[PDB]
Design a protein around this nucleic acid. Sequence first.
RNA 1: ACUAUGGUUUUUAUU
RNA 2: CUGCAUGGCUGUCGUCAGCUCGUGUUGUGAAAUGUUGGGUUAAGUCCCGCAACGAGCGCAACCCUUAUCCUUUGUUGCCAG
RNA 3: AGGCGGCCCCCUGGACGAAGACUGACGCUCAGGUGCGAAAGCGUGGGGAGCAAACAGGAUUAGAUACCCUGGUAGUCCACGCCGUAAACGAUGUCGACUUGGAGGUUGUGCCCUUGAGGCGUGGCUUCCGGAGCUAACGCGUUAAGUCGACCGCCUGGGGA
RNA 4: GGCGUAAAGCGCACGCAGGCGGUUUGUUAAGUCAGAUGUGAAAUCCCCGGGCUCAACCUGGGAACUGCAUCUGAUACUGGC
Lengths: 150, 206, 218
Amino acid sequence: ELQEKLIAVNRVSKTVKGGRIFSFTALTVVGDGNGRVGFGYGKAREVPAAIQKAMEKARRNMINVALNNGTLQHPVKGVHTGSRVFMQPASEGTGIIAGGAMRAVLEVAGVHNVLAKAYGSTNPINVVRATIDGLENMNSPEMVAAKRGK
Amino acid sequence: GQKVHPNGIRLGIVKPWNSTWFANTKEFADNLDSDFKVRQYLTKELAKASVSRIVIERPAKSIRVTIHTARPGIVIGKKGEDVEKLRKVVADIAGVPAQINIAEVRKPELDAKLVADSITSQLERRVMFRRAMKRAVQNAMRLGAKGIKVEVSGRLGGAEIARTEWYREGRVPLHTLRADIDYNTSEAHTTYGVIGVKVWIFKGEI
Amino acid sequence: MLKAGVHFGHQTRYWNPKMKPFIFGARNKVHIINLEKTVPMFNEALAELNKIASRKGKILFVGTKRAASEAVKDAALSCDQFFVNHRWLGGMLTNWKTVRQSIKRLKDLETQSQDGTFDKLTKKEALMRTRELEKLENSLGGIKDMGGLPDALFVIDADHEHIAIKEANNLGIPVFAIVDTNSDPDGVDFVIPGNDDAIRAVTLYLGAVAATVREGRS
RNA sequence: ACUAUGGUUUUUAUU
RNA sequence: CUGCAUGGCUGUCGUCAGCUCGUGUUGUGAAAUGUUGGGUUAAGUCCCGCAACGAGCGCAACCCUUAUCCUUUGUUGCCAG
RNA sequence: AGGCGGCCCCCUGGACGAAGACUGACGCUCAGGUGCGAAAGCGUGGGGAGCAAACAGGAUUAGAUACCCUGGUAGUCCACGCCGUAAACGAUGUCGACUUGGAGGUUGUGCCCUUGAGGCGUGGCUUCCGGAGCUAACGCGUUAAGUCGACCGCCUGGGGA
RNA sequence: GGCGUAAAGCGCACGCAGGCGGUUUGUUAAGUCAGAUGUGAAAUCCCCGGGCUCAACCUGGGAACUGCAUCUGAUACUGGC
């Protein structure tokens, strides 16, 4: 029904004077542990504001994961700039497989029986945009009157 | 911002004052020495009468005072038409005979002094304070008001870090002349660190 | 389906060659249209309008061109349907979750000249803010009573409007338009042949569509 | 109708 | 002793017209949009135009003050009739 | 390709279309090879009005080696050799192939009383526009940096090179 | 994995050796694949089990060395004719 998680936090770089700026950036995720996921980035002064702008973005989007035999319905490509992500299905009764930062997204989608490669930037705020380009590139047929599978 | 003071540099317009004292024009400079002699034993009696505001009234070679309290039963009991039990104290600490008056209070939780006392109770005790700040905002904004500032500085750790924070609600014009902003200063030292609490409430113009 | 006039014929080539949706031949430098490939479309353009009118779909009629801007107002006298005959703004539907503040300003200015502060000193100076009403009545005056978004948008020209198309088509609202052999459609969901002469576009078809809206029920 | 300089080190976020 | 600790008060531009907000829009993003653009002013002042719109603080108001003609008073002040 | 125009000339390679026809894969790309010069330079001989590396004269200036301003060599013109080279820069490799349209230029080939004191089809080439797409962005847009192929050459951090 | 630019397209064209090349019906079976024989020890990583207290050491078969040669076939596709 509902799963929530925190992935990353980083202070804004800017030397503004003299001193540095007090703006922070945050990345959070939402899902159901059954087949759905949503994500949010946010920017504000200090972490207790930046994390809430991120949560309020993550609580405004939801995408379905195409599943078969409890794993991905097919291998899929998803790209955003330097994050050139490929996601592929794994074997029965498996979960490691998943580790690193990809575990934090698969933990809210519910499916650790999924293997990924980034082929470039693993930068958390940018790789999260490439994985959802892959979830928009997931096939759900809508073809079974002519083509095989399911 | 942030030094424009609602009960300092902005107090000379549209606001009720807490002290007025009359004297010979040729000895006002001599009677100025008395302005602490009337407070030094009375300031620590105001919370013991639940007082929200005092008005010091001092006729030539005399003293009166008026105090505003929601809980007069703490200091006079029933029924409130004999003030003898307080008059006998005020006249003795002042060294002159006195005639004191007691006034009523409307919306006592819609007050910057009560909000400040409700937040200081957390920081003078080194406990969790943000619960009291959010409770004060959701108390005031649902009792009246159109915006509020509640601000804290020092010992906000996290162990030995200091920091400062507020998180505002509604709108609060601190640079407009005739805005009538209700305010209170709080400052303390626990003998282990300095703390401060700053409060401003906006209700309506003029 | 009822007229809906579609051919004269008249003019030489002003047609799109790419992209020839209705033309099939030429005679005496006049180009002729195929009306048999369009039977599935004539049985749809008003049949689907009746289907949403029978489901209380909120319908917005557009006619800013001076040949139609008054006939669409008599069409609103004979039908309780929404109409626009003045300007459009960028975000008029696609920014409604902010632009509704201008609608709430419009309704506040319709009562502002009855304020006791409006009677003071000079009549000319007292009206300076309430004069902003005549610009909101020109851009949002046609949609202030709708309380939300249209279910469909209806136009009788395929290229006179542009922002009226951008605000509906992007937002998933279907646009309905008629196409003469001097126009090419863009941003339109429902298309059929028609004419560019106001005596056919305005005088016939803008009546024939209101006869489809007055049928609901449900 | 007119000209070349500046070593090295280098401080606010809280009592 | 010391304004390279920690408060408080602080120079000058200058009453200067500027600094900002929420939800949309746009880019890979810092950033941009609006507040830019076109006339006008003392002016982010007001119209025009408009994928951005309406708003907040500053402004303008508000407050003080002056020549003239009135008005209250009528004194040890003033003297037209 | 680098490169090439005072004017007037001869010798000689090359492209392609419509109605069609013949030959019969004869078509593409290349290691090392093959071949030549813009402006200066060198050799070996001429020539000199103007301009002018170098060089001489006075200012300007702290100085002026530069500008100002008076003179001026080589060189610039000409030919046979040597030099064999750069931005030889339109920063783009040679070839084969598939895309969506507007108007003109140029060069072929058809049609319509040309009926207007004019137009429409359609190959080789081309100037401006112009719908998708490509890109870090500026750019490239059917003469693409789109989209797919054949072959060759090159490249692995700054500077040392 | 790249070569308009941040690092790389020869100054350019021609071309010997090399690399690459429309289409159909015959024909060949080199390349490709199929049915088998022979071999890749001891091992590799892995699946299941044994002689000795566990383990080495020794196992006893799987999975496997995807190649190389011979025999018997297939002929779409690529090459030869």
